[PDB]
Design a protein around this ligand. Sequence first.
Ligand SMILES: *C(=O)[C@@H](N)CCCC[NH3+]
Ligand SMILES: [Mg+2]
Ligand SMILES: [Mg+2]
Ligand SMILES: [Mg+2]
Ligand SMILES: [Mg+2]
Ligand SMILES: [Mg+2]
Ligand SMILES: [Mg+2]
Ligand SMILES: [Mg+2]
Ligand SMILES: [Mg+2]
Ligand SMILES: [Mg+2]
Ligand SMILES: [Mg+2]
Ligand SMILES: [Mg+2]
Ligand SMILES: [Mg+2]
Ligand SMILES: [Mg+2]
Ligand SMILES: [Mg+2]
Ligand SMILES: [Mg+2]
Ligand SMILES: [Mg+2]
Ligand SMILES: [Mg+2]
Ligand SMILES: [Mg+2]
Ligand SMILES: [Mg+2]
Ligand SMILES: [Mg+2]
Ligand SMILES: [Mg+2]
Ligand SMILES: [Mg+2]
Ligand SMILES: [Mg+2]
Ligand SMILES: [Mg+2]
Ligand SMILES: [Mg+2]
Ligand SMILES: [Mg+2]
Ligand SMILES: [Mg+2]
Ligand SMILES: [Mg+2]
Ligand SMILES: [Mg+2]
Ligand SMILES: [Mg+2]
Ligand SMILES: [Mg+2]
Ligand SMILES: [Mg+2]
Ligand SMILES: [Mg+2]
Ligand SMILES: [Mg+2]
Ligand SMILES: [Mg+2]
Ligand SMILES: [Mg+2]
Ligand SMILES: [Mg+2]
Ligand SMILES: [Mg+2]
Ligand SMILES: [Mg+2]
Ligand SMILES: [Mg+2]
Ligand SMILES: [Mg+2]
Ligand SMILES: [Mg+2]
Ligand SMILES: [Mg+2]
Ligand SMILES: [Mg+2]
Ligand SMILES: [Mg+2]
Ligand SMILES: [Mg+2]
Ligand SMILES: [Mg+2]
Ligand SMILES: [Mg+2]
Ligand SMILES: [Mg+2]
Ligand SMILES: [Mg+2]
Ligand SMILES: [Mg+2]
Ligand SMILES: [Mg+2]
Ligand SMILES: [Mg+2]
Length: 232
Amino acid sequence: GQKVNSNGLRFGINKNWISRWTANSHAQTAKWLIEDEKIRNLFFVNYRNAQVSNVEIERTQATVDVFVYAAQPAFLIGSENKNIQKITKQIKQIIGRTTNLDLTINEIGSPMLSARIIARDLANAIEARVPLRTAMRQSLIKVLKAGANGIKVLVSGRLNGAEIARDKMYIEGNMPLSTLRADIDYALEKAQTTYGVIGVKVWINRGMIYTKGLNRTPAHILHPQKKQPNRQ
RNA sequence: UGUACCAUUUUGAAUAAGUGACGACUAACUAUGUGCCAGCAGUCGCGGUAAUACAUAGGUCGCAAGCGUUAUCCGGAUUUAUUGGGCGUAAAGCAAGCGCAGGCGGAUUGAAAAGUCUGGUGUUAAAGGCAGCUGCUUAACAGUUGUAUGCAUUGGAAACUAUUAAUCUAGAGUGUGGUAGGGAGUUUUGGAAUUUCAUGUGGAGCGGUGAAAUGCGUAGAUAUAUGAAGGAACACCAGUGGCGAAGGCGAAAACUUAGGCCAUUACUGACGCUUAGGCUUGAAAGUGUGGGGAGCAAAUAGGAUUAGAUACCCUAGUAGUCCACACCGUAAACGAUAGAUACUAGCUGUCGGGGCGAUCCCCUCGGUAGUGAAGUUAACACAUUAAGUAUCUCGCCUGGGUAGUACAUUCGCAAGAAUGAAACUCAAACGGAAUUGACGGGGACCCGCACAAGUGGUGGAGCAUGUUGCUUAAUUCGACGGUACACGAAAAACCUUACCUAGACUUGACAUCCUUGGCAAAAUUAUGGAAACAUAAUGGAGGUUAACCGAGUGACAGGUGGUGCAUGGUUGUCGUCAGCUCGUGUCGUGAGAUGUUGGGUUAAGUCCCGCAACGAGCGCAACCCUUAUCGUUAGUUACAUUGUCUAGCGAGACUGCUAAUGCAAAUUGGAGGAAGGAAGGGAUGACGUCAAAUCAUCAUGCCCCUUAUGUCUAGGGCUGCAAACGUGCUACAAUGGCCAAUACAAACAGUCGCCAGCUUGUAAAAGUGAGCAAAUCUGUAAAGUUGGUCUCAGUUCGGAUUGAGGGCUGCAAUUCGUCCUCAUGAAGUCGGAAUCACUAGUAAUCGCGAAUCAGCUAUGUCGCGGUGAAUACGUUCUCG
RNA sequence: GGUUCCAUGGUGUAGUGGAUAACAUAUCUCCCUGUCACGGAGGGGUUGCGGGUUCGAUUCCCGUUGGAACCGCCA
RNA sequence: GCAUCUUUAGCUCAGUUGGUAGAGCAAAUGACUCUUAAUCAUUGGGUCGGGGGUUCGAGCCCCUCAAGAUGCACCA
RNA sequence: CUGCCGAUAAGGUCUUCAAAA
Ligand SMILES: *C(=O)[C@@H](N)CCCC[NH3+]
Ligand SMILES: [Mg+2]
Ligand SMILES: [Mg+2]
Ligand SMILES: [Mg+2]
Ligand SMILES: [Mg+2]
Ligand SMILES: [Mg+2]
Ligand SMILES: [Mg+2]
Ligand SMILES: [Mg+2]
Ligand SMILES: [Mg+2]
Ligand SMILES: [Mg+2]
Ligand SMILES: [Mg+2]
Ligand SMILES: [Mg+2]
Ligand SMILES: [Mg+2]
Ligand SMILES: [Mg+2]
Ligand SMILES: [Mg+2]
Ligand SMILES: [Mg+2]
Ligand SMILES: [Mg+2]
Ligand SMILES: [Mg+2]
Ligand SMILES: [Mg+2]
Ligand SMILES: [Mg+2]
Ligand SMILES: [Mg+2]
Ligand SMILES: [Mg+2]
Ligand SMILES: [Mg+2]
Ligand SMILES: [Mg+2]
Ligand SMILES: [Mg+2]
Ligand SMILES: [Mg+2]
Ligand SMILES: [Mg+2]
Ligand SMILES: [Mg+2]
Ligand SMILES: [Mg+2]
Ligand SMILES: [Mg+2]
Ligand SMILES: [Mg+2]
Ligand SMILES: [Mg+2]
Ligand SMILES: [Mg+2]
Ligand SMILES: [Mg+2]
Ligand SMILES: [Mg+2]
Ligand SMILES: [Mg+2]
Ligand SMILES: [Mg+2]
Ligand SMILES: [Mg+2]
Ligand SMILES: [Mg+2]
Ligand SMILES: [Mg+2]
Ligand SMILES: [Mg+2]
Ligand SMILES: [Mg+2]
Ligand SMILES: [Mg+2]
Ligand SMILES: [Mg+2]
Ligand SMILES: [Mg+2]
Ligand SMILES: [Mg+2]
Ligand SMILES: [Mg+2]
Ligand SMILES: [Mg+2]
Ligand SMILES: [Mg+2]
Ligand SMILES: [Mg+2]
Ligand SMILES: [Mg+2]
Ligand SMILES: [Mg+2]
Ligand SMILES: [Mg+2]
Ligand SMILES: [Mg+2]
């Protein structure tokens, strides 16, 4: 049957919001809401070879702050800070010159156990004509070796160019979806294949959060260092 | 025959490549076209608008001066099985027996030598066959030498078979001695019971069924008691049994008669097994002649049931069922297993003879059963009574339908029996066994407003809204049992809008990429205008082009156009039901089984035990939110009748204690407690099913349009109307209508808004106008209490419809907004067959608020509080 | 050629001694079921043509059509 | 022979008794479905057998032909 | 505790593949 979004079921209890701002009026609540979606989509659609895991947005009456986590930030940084200037101009055109931006790339730790880049890698493999069975298994084994709990991958679509759509799942371990205390990270991606669209869904279990609180604490960014800059 | 061949003879790549296939068997794939059409096919099968199977093209593969197709023969085919198959459940053991000819057949001795083996000789024509060699440029081919097979004759071998001459008893029979039987035929005899009749008593039904009705009965039935007549069959005994070759045999007796078991110091001395043809017997039905006929009952008549009933039920009812003599010769005639012979673990019964002598029990020899290993089988299963290891003999089988049909023949009075095909057609078969599911008008157990017990409704009337159908220029599109129909749509006058009629536009209303400049787009005022749009004006923020304003410019933009049966995403449903699987191991040739099923306990695959299973994952449960009590922090904009109230943290409830019984989980009761055994509610919805819903939220493969299916605007339309259905509102009333006074909420919302008060107005509202960015100000609570009146009427019920006058929003209210006032006063007096929801603050009912919104007969949707019930005995029926 | 009968709903048939027309099937709407048949409720639909009598004709009278049933013989 | 009737889209038949034609099938088109069947809507399709005559006007009334079928004589 | 209880148009998907990591 149908299931409630795993990310959406855990918001406001154990998971913080990706955008944290309070608008002035119901007219300014819509502009500030579509614009941040454009920024997030920009980061995700293009600049994909970087493995951007999550982009957070922080806005005040007039000051915009962006916290961008990536696995390989060299591509964003570019050759002696070139590509970086380009993206700043991109961000300024979307929000406006009248405001103040404080974009912040922040390098990420433990990149494997994140459902976003795994789905992106999965989608790239399917688009690259890689056999589906082999592609998921290599991603599954590497993620488990990274030192996490069970992972559930559902890859539904016109499998292998077939005319009848199927779906292949591969769970390997305890994925307690009905439990609220668990840390389940979820992401979904659309692999654009020449024979249509492939939907990949990745459920990852990253332990149990036994410390009550609406997070305010990082998630799989702590193990190695996490810095770099571009801020003020 | 100037032929093969030869040569440094001239010229010169010049004179020369096709066919089949490409989904699998079977080496070799893509596009275009078509769209269950045209076509392909040796087999499985491809084609229903994304075809590697069709057509064309490109590529590739298999062959080659050949390649495919067709025809015929052999192999593969162990698929007529001598080598080399089978007959319990798949085709196939005759219904059984007596059996001649045929086949086979105990042991020992002698002879012969017909089979059998071997030596010599003759022959089995030449070509061909196989081996070697030679010759053609090697080969194909030609020649060359070698190379068997059988028959006859002759000379030996004597193990086995056959023949002959004899001996023996162990095979098989005979006799004596024990002995068990529903074995058969013929002739007599007996008692219950039914029916009819005769005689009494008696007095209204009997009979029959799911329920009844034909029928019988005051002419005295049913019933009761006695008697007589007659026919058929032989309760109990009677069986985890007996006899016979089979069919079959069960009251008692007599006569005749068949076979069998056990022990044999007796006798014959292979006389034995099987059996084509032949003969005998052979359930029931049926036939012919003559008797008999109580009961029952094919055919038949009537009454029921039924859409129909020539059937199941009931009441009658002939042939027949019975006997004697003649036929018929078929059955699931079954142990679905032909007969005979020898061998191969065991255990438990039961019957008969014999040995012992109370039975009972022990042993021996046989008959009849159950369980069971090796062994066999495709599996089920058989297993000393074989379907096991083997031999002999007979019968029978060779895919399914045609078909046990047709012709011919034999038998029969007759129906028919025996024997028994083919033409044609299919790729399989009402094939066999077993496995996983589904289903059952099959069982066992357990659940849910399912039934049951109640309450209030719906189907009847008026109105609102959605749908079907019809119409129209359009009535845009989708949803269509449960799981569509107050659904998408949380707002159709314009806009929305996707539709129709018209007036206008073409790299376009919007976008990027490119050569190139920016010294604008807006908005608004004029004129023509239905408005789109044009011609003229202030020429405009800014920042030198940032963004945009453009020119030039072709790739293109654009599509609510098709396909939810190509999809991604999201959702309904079973269902918040308790399920769905995996790893390792074990069993099974295999699909598969195990765990996951057994016993207890739950809402639960929840847990505990048992257990060839041991564990694990998803679901279940808990962690999350909210309501119920209290502690702590805080005290304004709450409270201020002083500790409410509001929201942060925490305590509290954990089967924690006790009693009962259970191994243990756990169930029930009690204690204390605000709360007791998921304390109430919410979020949370496994694998999957229905090719379930959506291309019209969005995204997207493919197809289609490209001065039009794209774009702008005005008007119309989505609001129609002979009709039908669904969901709601209002009612049909005194538990009420109207009027007056009046008490008690929670939640939510608010600066183009909430709007207090005041003034005007019969009122919707207008003007003035504070207060409130909000625990402060505003959004009148109604049912309810009291008083007056109506007095049961189509009314002081009910409000539809209609006419007029007003108010608000908005350019604009006619198509098509709602509110108020006045006027009128349809139907309707509790609603047919049949249906829906609900297990406590629930049903019922009364108001209040919010979302989308300028406004909206939203009576809709999402929320909040006021009052506040009835019933649950139980699973027989009903749905899942 | 002559004589008797009949003409009623969409189909098969009753009635009316002048004042009045029903039955069954069929048809329609609604329960019913996954659906349909069957079942349940309710709804609907009629005198061959003509011409006279009567206040009034399906009925009574005379003619005209169509369909049937009887006869048409003696030489 | 005679008297009588009939000839009507592709087929089977009503037309009405004079103002010039439909019904039911078949075909097609859509709708409808995965696609069909079925269903449903819609729909094109006529020398009223050939000529003559009457009439202002003939599928309609009267004649002659062409092709069939009826009832009356293969002399009672 | 034996009422009654009938039917359901045709053809169709779906396993691509282990060479292996
Ligand atoms: C019999 O029928 C006769 N009267 C008829 C003779 C006819 C001759 N033309
Ligand atoms: Mg071909
Ligand atoms: Mg082809
Ligand atoms: Mg062969
Ligand atoms: Mg052979
Ligand atoms: Mg065989
Ligand atoms: Mg057989
Ligand atoms: Mg036998
Ligand atoms: Mg037999
Ligand atoms: Mg014998
Ligand atoms: Mg003999
Ligand atoms: Mg020779
Ligand atoms: Mg030769
Ligand atoms: Mg007697
Ligand atoms: Mg008999
Ligand atoms: Mg009868
Ligand atoms: Mg009887
Ligand atoms: Mg008889
Ligand atoms: Mg037989
Ligand atoms: Mg056995
Ligand atoms: Mg045959
Ligand atoms: Mg035979
Ligand atoms: Mg058959
Ligand atoms: Mg089965
Ligand atoms: Mg009830
Ligand atoms: Mg109603
Ligand atoms: Mg009605
Ligand atoms: Mg519609
Ligand atoms: Mg649809
Ligand atoms: Mg549905
Ligand atoms: Mg409009
Ligand atoms: Mg300027
Ligand atoms: Mg410039
Ligand atoms: Mg499109
Ligand atoms: Mg679907
Ligand atoms: Mg077990
Ligand atoms: Mg168990
Ligand atoms: Mg839960
Ligand atoms: Mg569908
Ligand atoms: Mg309009
Ligand atoms: Mg509407
Ligand atoms: Mg309602
Ligand atoms: Mg009162
Ligand atoms: Mg105050
Ligand atoms: Mg009335
Ligand atoms: Mg009223
Ligand atoms: Mg109006
Ligand atoms: Mg009343
Ligand atoms: Mg309940
Ligand atoms: Mg009510
Ligand atoms: Mg209904
Ligand atoms: Mg005479
Ligand atoms: Mg369709
Ligand atoms: Mg019944």
